[PDB]
């Protein structure tokens, strides 16, 4: 009868030591959620990097990315699980503005609006990836399936002077790319209170620096979180 308490105390001490080690390991790593459409090209981003988890480390920092496979349901109740993630990586194909499979771009905009305006994901920032940039350029310069017909607001839109055009680029596709970015940006800024931001990136399949981009975006996210905990920023 007396030895039972001692055995329980020893087991508790061993479990507590293991839990402290797990505390260190868990706090070391960062968790990211990968959301996108099936044709958005998330597989391309995964290759560069029920549920698929890929672990990558850069600059001796452990990053854990979780991609939810299947579960193709409009209603998302599992998404409340990803409340402690560092960021939500959103992948959208900007070249799919014309595909019927409600346009794909409009469906992605609606999905981004739903994710942004979620009670659980209030503090979680979103990293936005715009794949198939080359395909978008090929479509825009082709002269077929103009943005204006699919997106009426494109006609009134004007290219922003305070932009960063590519070193070798065509003004028409630059206008298209910045309009596609600005749609998501205005969805982001309409309801954000400064607790979470959106980082739009023009990515490509050939590009291999997306890991560095996600690392920088996570650094900025944590830095802004720490700044906003205090009255600064």
């Amino acid at each position: 009868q007396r030895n039972e308490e001692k055995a329980q105390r020893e087991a508790n001490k061993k479990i507590e030591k293991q839990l402290q080690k797990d505390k260190q390991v868990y706090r070391a790593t960062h968790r990211l959620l990968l959301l996108g459409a099936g044709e958005s090209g998330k597989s391309t981003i995964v290759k560069q990097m029920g549920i698929f988890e890929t672990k990558f480390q850069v600059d001796k920092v452990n990053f854990h990315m979780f991609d939810v496979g299947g579960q193709r349901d409009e209603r998302r109740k599992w998404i409340q699980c990803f409340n402690d993630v560092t960021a939500i990586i959103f992948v959208v194909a900007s070249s799919s503005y014309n595909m019927v499979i409600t346009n794909r771009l409009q469906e992605a905009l609606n999905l981004f609006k739903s994710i942004w305006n979620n009670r659980w994901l209030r503090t979680i920032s979103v990293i936005l990836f715009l794949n198939k940039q080359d395909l978008l350029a090929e479509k825009v310069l082709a002269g077929k399936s103009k943005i204006e017909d699919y997106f009426p607001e494109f006609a009134r839109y004007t290219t922003p002077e305070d932009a960063t055009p590519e070193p070798g680029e065509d003004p028409r596709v630059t206008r298209a790319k910045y309009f596609i970015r600005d749609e998501f940006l205005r969805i982001s800024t309409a309801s954000g209170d400064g607790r979470h931001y959106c980082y739009p990136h023009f990515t490509c399949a050939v590009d291999t620096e997306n890991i560095r981009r996600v690392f920088n975006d996570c650094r900025d996210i944590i830095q802004r979180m720490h700044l906003r905990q205090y009255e600064l920023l």
Binding site: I15, E16, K23, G70, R75, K77
Partner: protein, 331 residues
């Protein structure tokens, strides 16, 4: 053509249920004495979890309980001495439910991975990995030492056999992601609720849906079954909690207040069935007088949202595990 027949059948069901409304539960229960105010103090606080807790399950003996968290740890506590008997790492970090076998030898857990893992406590390794679901698995309960029912986001509930690892019986026809299920005191029957407002009753042996109830207006996050075996109360994302009756086929009373607008994540009944304890999206937890639908007391000790609620078999203790790692035992 068939849609007209379905509409006629639904109208017939509505008329038949309206015919049995002899007197509401409020009219009969208004004569009985009020339960009064119940104040509950946190007797034990259990610490050691790393992330938010989703589900717990009291043991058949009131001493032991098991809890699950987003670290991937399935910690088993001795609630009397606040001692972690076992700490079970999980293959997948995401887990949304847990269960503790009535014999006390097995523990099961499952999450966004469709596989349901069953652990052998007395031997701690994975005795069997139950696979076959398509969506995220939401709840688990042990019918016996060899049978387990799992409800997933596949909009189906399944009955498993641990020895063979196959779905002995599959329950279908339920239009939403099933969130929670509860068993009768006897093994014969169980009930479940999903994202659609409908909560359905099932028969384990036959595998067919005997009854359905559509009282709610939003997703049914939680469900609990009355100790008498003839009623069950379901929580919802809507602030209402409603008590249904199997023999009557419609709700008897509704538990809500205009002050509260948050949803309900976990419900449970006291041993006598008088007190209906229900967790809420806001930080506190509420205690409802089931007979009279008057809030008896409030259990406010949690910093974050309450995700799991349980009452032990003998009714001595009430355990609440919120989205902070702290799990508290009330009494």
């Amino acid at each position: 053509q068939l849609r007209q027949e379905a509409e006629q059948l639904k109208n017939q069901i509505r008329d038949a249920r309206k015919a049995c409304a002899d007197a509401t539960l409020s009219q009969i229960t208004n004569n009985i004495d009020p339960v009064g105010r119940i104040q509950m103090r946190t007797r034990r606080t259990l610490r050691g979890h790393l992330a938010k807790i989703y589900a717990m399950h009291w043991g058949t003996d009131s001493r032991l309980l098991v809890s699950a968290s987003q670290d991937g740890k399935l910690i088993i506590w001795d609630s009397y001495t606040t001692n972690k008997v076992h700490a079970i790492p999980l293959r997948s970090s995401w887990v949304m439910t847990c269960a503790y076998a009535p014999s006390g030898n097995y523990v099961a857990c499952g999450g966004l991975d469709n596989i349901c893992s069953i652990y052998n406590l007395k031997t701690v390794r994975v005795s069997r990995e139950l696979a076959g679901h398509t969506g995220y698995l939401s709840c688990c309960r042990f019918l016996d030492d060899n049978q387990i029912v799992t409800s997933s986001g596949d909009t189906t509930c399944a009955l498993w056999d641990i020895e063979t690892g196959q779905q002995t019986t599959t329950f279908t026809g339920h239009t939403g992601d099933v969130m929670s299920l509860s068993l009768a005191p006897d093994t014969r029957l169980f009930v479940s609720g999903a994202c659609d407002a409908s909560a359905k009753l099932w028969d384990v042996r036959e595998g067919m849906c005997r009854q359905t109830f559509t009282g709610h207006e939003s997703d049914i996050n939680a469900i609990c079954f009355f100790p008498n075996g003839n009623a069950f109360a379901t929580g919802s994302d809507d602030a209402t909690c409603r008590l249904f009756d199997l023999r009557a086929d419609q709700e008897l009373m509704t538990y809500s207040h205009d002050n509260i607008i948050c949803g309900i994540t976990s419900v449970s009944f006291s041993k006598s069935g008088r007190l209906l304890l229900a967790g809420y999206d806001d930080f506190n937890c509420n205690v409802w007088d089931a007979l009279k639908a008057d809030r008896a007391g409030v259990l406010a000790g949690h910093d974050n949202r309450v995700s799991c609620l349980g009452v032990t078999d003998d009714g001595m203790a009430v355990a609440t595990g919120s989205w902070d790692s702290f799990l508290k035992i009330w009494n």
